[PDB]
Write a protein that binds this ligand. Structure first.
Ligand SMILES: CCCCCCCC/C=C\CCCCCCCC(=O)O[C@@H](COC(=O)CCCCCCCCCCCCCCC)COP(=O)([O-])OCC[N+](C)(C)C
Ligand SMILES: CCCCCCCC/C=C\CCCCCCCC(=O)O[C@@H](COC(=O)CCCCCCCCCCCCCCC)COP(=O)([O-])OCC[N+](C)(C)C
Ligand SMILES: CC(=O)[C@H]1CC[C@H]2[C@@H]3CC=C4C[C@@H](OS(=O)(=O)O)CC[C@]4(C)[C@H]3CC[C@]12C
Ligand SMILES: CC(=O)[C@H]1CC[C@H]2[C@@H]3CC=C4C[C@@H](OS(=O)(=O)O)CC[C@]4(C)[C@H]3CC[C@]12C
Lengths: 280, 134, 147, 189, 51
C-alpha cells in the first residue's frame, strides 16, 4: 500500500489541504455572505474525508464560492483515489517470488548435530562428489553415510516424500532432473550455484597421440555451435523458461495495521498533552 | 478470496478497538459527545462507506483516530479491488501452442494424450524423424 | 587484472580488503596510458586481481619467479592477413607467446580451436560464455496528466 | 490498463532475438576488436549478417564499450559473461540480460613445449577441489551490493500527478474572482 | 421512512454513495442498511476489478 504515490505526492497533497482549507475558511467564507460556524478544523476534517473515500460525517460550507472550491477538491479526491488503486493494481499484477535456502556455505551442512533438527542430506557414493566431500569436509562425509543413496532416481523421489531436503550430485545431472520434473517442485538453490566447478571429458590413454586431435575436435564443436544444438536437443528443460495470485494475509498487510496502531499511540500522546494544557 | 480468513478477523476486530478507544478519548478529554453506541456506528460506517451514524468525534485526540481510521478503511477497500484485479487478470488457463516445438509437452506423460490416425502420412513423418522418436 | 599507476617512489600502493587481508600486487611494465606509438614509453604500473592472485599461487606451488608485463598491442589475439607483409601472424597476447616475449599468458584467454592449434591451454580456471550487456531500465510512467 | 501495459519493451535478450539477427541503424551492438568473439562470429555461417554490423562498430577494449553503454551510444555489448556480470553487480545502471553461448572457459596459455603444462593444469584442478578458486571468486567477482532487476512497476511521481494539483491551485486563483462576483451579485440584486 | 425513501437509499449505496438520503432510525433497520453497505462495497469492488 506504500508502493504507488511517491511520498512527494502525499506530502504535497497535505499542503494542498492546508492551503485550500485556509483559503476556504479565511477568504471564501468570511467574505462571502451566509457565513454552525465553519472553522479551520471543520474544513480539514471535510477535505480529508473527501480524499479518503468520503464516508465520515462532515459539515459543509454555506457560501457558493466555498462550495465551488470544495467541489473542485472533490474532483481531485476522485482522481487521487482512482490513480491509487489503479497503480496498486499494477503492483499486485506484476510481482515475483524469492527463495529460502542460501547454499552450501551455510553451517547446516558443516554442523548438523549442534544445530537445528538434523538436516538430512546425502550423495551417491563411489564418485567424484564423494571424494570432494571426503577430502574437504570429513565431518560432513561421516554424517552423510547414513543418507547415502543407491541412484539418482531413488534420491530424486525421496525429496518429494520428505525423506531428504538436500541432494548432492553433479550440476549437469541435478539441473537436468529439476528441468524435467513434473509439477515444478524441485528447484535448485542459488539458481545454479556450482561448487568445485569442473567438467566432463573423454578419458584417453596416457601419452596418446589421439588426445591432441580429440581435444581440437571437441573445440571444433564449440566453435561452430554444434554444442548449442546438442544442449538444446538433449539438455532441454520444461521449467527452465520460468506471477501468481496470492491472498493478502496479516504478514502482507501488517504495514497498514502498524499505522493504525501508531495512530493509537499518537492519539494517546495528544490525550495526555492536551490534559497538561488545560490542567496548567 | 482477496483476504485471508484471519485478515478479515483483524479488520473486523480493529473496528471495535477504534470504536472503544474513540469513546474513551472523547470523554476523559478536558476539551454532542461520542457515546459508545454511536462510536460503533462511526467506525463501521467509515469502513462500510454507509451514511449510518450522525455522530463524529469532537475531541482533538479522537478526531486523529477518525482521520487515520478513514485512511485505513480506504486502503483496505483499495487493496481488495487491487488484489481482486490481480486475481482476475492472471487466472488465465494455458492451452497448447507453438506446434510440436513446444518443450512443455515435448516429453510425454500420461496426463495428456497425443494421437494420430494409424497408417497415414503423419505416422511416416514421425517414424522417419530423428528427434521425434520419443 | 586491475592496472593502476605506481606511486611516486615507484612502489605498489598498499590497500587492504574489507575483511582485513592485504591485497597482493605485482609490478607491471606495460605501455603508456594511451598508446606506445607516439609516446614510446612503457611506464611501470601495479597489477592485482583474480588472475594475478591465481598466478601468485601457481608460483608458490611450482617454485618459479615471474616478470608480469602488459600487452603492447592491448589485444587478446587473432589471425590477421596484413597484406603489407603477406603473412599470417597473431597480434598481441597470442603473438607474444609465439614470438618468445612471454613464457605464459595469465589472463582471460578463452580456449579456442584456432588458439589451441598453436599454443596449449591448461584446464579452465573460469567456466564462462558470451552474453549481452544492456542498460538498466529506470521505471518512469508515461502518464502525461490525469486526462 | 495503461499502467499495467506501460512496459518499456521487454529486453534486448539473447542472440535468438531477431533484432540482433538483422542489422538496423537504431540498434547498435559491438564487441572488442581481435578477440575470441570476433573469431566466433566470423567462423559462424548463419551470423554473417551480424558480423558485418559488428565490423563497423567494434571497440578497441572492453573498458570503452562498457562506458559506451553507460553513455547510451551503445545498447548491446557481446563479451565474456564473467566480465559483464561483474559490471552488473558493481554498476546499477547496467543489467545483464541474455542466455550464454559459446561456453568455453579461460585457460593459462603456454607454448607447445611447456615443461609446466602438466603441473599447471593439476594445480588448477586441485585449487578447484580445494575451494581456492571459490575464495578468489568471492574476493574479486561476487560483490553484489546492487540489485539486478525488477518488474518495473513505476510509482506515480509528482510530475505525473501534477495535472490535478495545478487544477486545484487554479481553483483557488479562480475562486479569488468568484468571491468578488458573489459579493457583487448580492449587492446587485 | 417509506418504500420510496428506502429504494433511493439502497440504490445510492451500490452506486458509490453520493446522493442525499434519509437514513432509518431503528437499530435493526440500521443493521440491515449496514449489511447492504457491505454488499455495495464488494459489488463495486468486483465491478472495477473485472472491468
Ligand atoms: C473490504 C471492505 C470492508 C471490510 C469489512 C470487514 C468486516 C469484517 C468483520 C467481521 C468478520 C468476522 C470473521 C469473518 C471471516 C471468518 C473466517 C474464519 O474464521 O474462517 C475459519 C475457517 O474458514 C473457513 O472455513 C472459510 C471462511 C469462513 C467464513 C465464515 C463466514 C461467517 C463469518 C461471520 C459472519 C458475520 C458475523 C457478524 C460480524 C460482526 C478460519 O479460522 P478458524 O475458525 O480458527 O479455522 C479453524 C476452524 N475450527 C476452529 C473450528 C477448528
Ligand atoms: C447466523 C447469522 C447469519 C446472518 C449473518 C449475516 C452477516 C452479519 C449480519 C449481521 C450482524 C450484525 C452485527 C451486530 C449484531 C449484534 C446486535 C447488536 O446489538 O449490535 C450492536 C452492535 O452492532 C453494530 O453496531 C453492527 C453494525 C454493523 C453490522 C455488521 C455489518 C457488517 C456485515 C458483515 C461484514 C463481515 C463479513 C465477513 C465475512 C462473512 C448494535 O449497535 P449499537 O451501537 O450497540 O446499537 C445501540 C442502539 N441504538 C442505536 C438505539 C443506540
Ligand atoms: C500520523 C500517523 O500515525 C502515521 C503517519 C505516517 C505513518 C507511518 C507511515 C509509514 C510507516 C512504515 C511502516 O513500515 S512497515 O515495514 O512496518 O510496514 C510502519 C508504519 C509507519 C512508520 C507509519 C506509522 C504511522 C504514521 C506515523
Ligand atoms: C490516513 C493516513 O494517515 C495514511 C493514509 C495513507 C498513508 C500514506 C501511504 C503511503 C505513504 C508513502 C510512504 O513512502 S515511503 O517512501 O516512506 O515508503 C510514506 C508514508 C505515506 C505518505 C503514508 C502516510 C500516512 C497516510 C497518509
Amino acid at each position: 500500500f506504500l508502493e504507488p504515490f511517491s511520498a512527494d505526492v502525499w506530502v504535497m497533497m497535505f499542503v494542498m489541504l492546508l492551503i485550500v482549507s485556509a483559503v476556504a475558511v479565511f477568504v471564501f467564507e468570511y467574505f462571502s455572505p451566509v457565513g454552525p460556524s465553519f472553522t479551520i478544523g471543520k474544513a480539514i476534517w471535510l477535505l480529508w474525508g473527501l480524499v479518503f473515500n468520503n464516508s465520515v460525517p462532515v459539515q459543509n460550507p454555506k457560501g457558493t464560492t466555498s462550495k465551488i472550491m470544495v467541489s473542485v477538491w472533490a474532483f481531485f479526491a476522485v482522481i487521487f483515489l482512482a490513480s491509487y488503486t489503479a497503480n496498486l493494481a499494477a503492483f499486485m499484477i506484476q510481482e515475483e517470488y524469492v527463495d529460502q535456502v542460501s547454499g552450501l556455505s551455510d553451517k547446516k551442512f558443516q554442523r548438523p548435530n549442534d544445530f537445528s533438527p538434523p538436516f538430512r542430506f546425502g550423495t551417491v557414493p563411489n564418485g567424484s562428489t564423494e571424494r570432494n566431500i571426503r577430502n574437504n569436509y570429513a565431518e560432513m562425509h561421516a554424517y552423510m553415510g547414513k543418507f547415502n543413496q543407491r541412484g539418482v532416481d531413488d534420491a530424486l523421489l525421496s525429496l518429494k516424500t520428505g525423506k531428504l531436503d538436500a541432494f548432492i550430485y553433479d550440476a549437469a545431472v541435478l539441473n537436468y532432473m529439476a528441468g524435467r520434473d513434473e509439477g515444478c517442485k524441485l528447484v535448485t538453490i542459488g539458481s545454479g550455484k556450482v561448487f568445485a566447478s569442473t567438467g566432463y571429458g573423454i578419458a584417453i590413454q596416457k601419452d596418446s597421440g589421439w588426445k591432441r586431435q580429440v581435444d581440437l575436435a571437441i573445440l571444433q564443436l564449440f566453435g561452430d555451435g554444434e554444442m548449442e544444438e546438442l544442449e538444446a536437443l538433449w539438455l532441454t528443460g520444461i521449467c527452465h523458461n520460468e506471477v501468481m495470485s496470492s491472498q493478502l494475509d496479516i504478514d502482507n498487510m501488517a504495514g497498514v495495521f502498524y499505522m493504525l496502531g501508531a495512530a493509537m499511540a499518537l492519539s494517546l500522546i495528544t490525550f495526555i498533552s492536551e490534559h497538561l494544557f488545560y490542567w496548567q | 478470496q482477496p483476504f485471508q480468513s484471519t485478515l478479515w478477523l483483524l479488520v473486523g476486530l480493529s473496528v471495535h478497538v477504534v470504536a472503544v478507544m474513540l469513546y474513551l478519548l472523547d470523554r476523559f478529554s478536558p476539551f454532542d459527545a461520542l457515546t459508545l453506541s454511536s462510536a460503533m456506528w462511526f467506525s463501521w460506517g467509515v469502513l462500510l462507506n454507509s451514511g449510518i451514524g450522525e455522530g463524529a468525534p469532537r475531541s482533538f485526540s479522537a478526531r486523529i483516530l477518525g482521520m487515520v481510521w478513514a485512511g485505513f478503511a480506504m486502503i483496505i477497500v483499495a487493496s481488495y479491488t487491487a488484489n481482486l484485479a490481480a486475481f482476475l487478470v492472471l487466472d488465465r488457463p494455458e492451452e497448447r501452442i507453438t506446434g510440436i516445438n513446444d518443450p512443455r509437452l515435448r516429453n510425454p506423460s500420461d496426463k495428456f494424450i497425443y494421437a494420430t490416425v494409424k497408417q497415414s502420412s503423419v505416422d511416416i513423418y514421425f517414424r522417419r524423424q530423428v528427434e521425434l522418436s520419443t | 587484472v586491475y592496472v593502476k599507476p605506481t606511486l611516486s617512489d615507484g612502489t605498489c600502493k598498499e590497500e587492504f580488503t574489507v575483511n582485513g587481508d592485504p591485497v597482493k600486487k605485482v609490478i607491471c611494465t606495460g605501455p603508456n596510458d594511451t598508446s606506445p606509438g607516439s609516446p614510446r614509453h612503457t611506464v611501470p604500473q601495479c597489477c592485482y586481481g583474480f588472475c594475478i592472485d591465481l598466478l601468485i599461487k601457481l608460483a608458490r606451488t611450482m617454485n618459479f619467479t615471474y616478470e608480469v608485463h602488459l600487452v603492447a598491442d592491448g589485444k587478446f589475439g587473432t589471425q590477421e592477413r596484413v597484406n603489407n607483409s603477406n603473412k599470417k601472424e597473431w597480434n598481441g597476447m597470442m603473438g607474444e607467446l609465439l614470438s618468445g616475449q612471454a613464457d605464459m599468458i595469465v589472463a582471460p584467454l578463452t580456449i579456442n580451436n584456432e588458439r589451441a592449434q598453436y599454443i596449449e591451454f591448461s584446464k579452465p580456471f573460469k567456466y564462462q560464455g558470451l552474453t549481452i550487456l544492456v542498460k538498466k531500465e529506470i521505471p518512469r510512467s508515461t502518464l502525461d496528466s490525469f486526462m | 490498463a495503461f499502467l499495467v501495459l506501460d512496459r518499456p519493451e521487454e529486453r534486448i535478450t539473447g542472440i535468438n532475438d531477431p533484432r540482433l539477427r538483422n542489422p538496423s541503424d537504431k540498434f547498435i551492438y559491438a564487441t572488442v576488436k581481435q578477440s575470441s568473439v570476433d573469431i566466433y562470429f566470423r567462423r559462424q555461417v548463419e551470423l554473417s549478417t551480424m558480423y558485418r554490423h559488428m565490423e563497423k562498430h567494434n571497440y578497441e577494449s572492453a573498458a570503452e564499450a562498457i562506458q559506451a553503454v553507460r553513455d547510451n551510444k551503445l545498447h548491446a555489448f557481446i563479451w565474456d559473461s564473467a566480465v559483464l556480470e561483474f559490471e552488473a553487480s558493481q554498476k546499477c545502471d547496467l543489467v545483464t540480460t541474455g542466455e550464454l553461448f559459446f561456453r568455453s572457459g579461460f585457460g593459462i596459455g603456454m607454448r607447445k613445449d611447456s615443461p609446466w603444462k602438466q603441473n599447471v593444469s593439476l594445480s588448477i584442478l586441485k585449487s578447484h577441489e580445494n575451494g581456492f578458486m571459490e575464495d578468489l571468486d568471492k574476493t574479486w567477482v561476487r560483490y553484489q551490493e546492487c540489485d539486478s532487476r525488477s518488474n518495473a512497476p513505476a510509482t506515480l511521481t509528482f510530475e505525473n500527478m501534477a495535472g490535478v494539483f495545478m487544477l486545484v491551485a487554479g481553483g483557488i486563483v479562480a475562486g479569488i474572482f468568484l468571491i468578488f462576483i458573489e459579493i457583487a451579485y448580492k449587492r446587485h440584486k
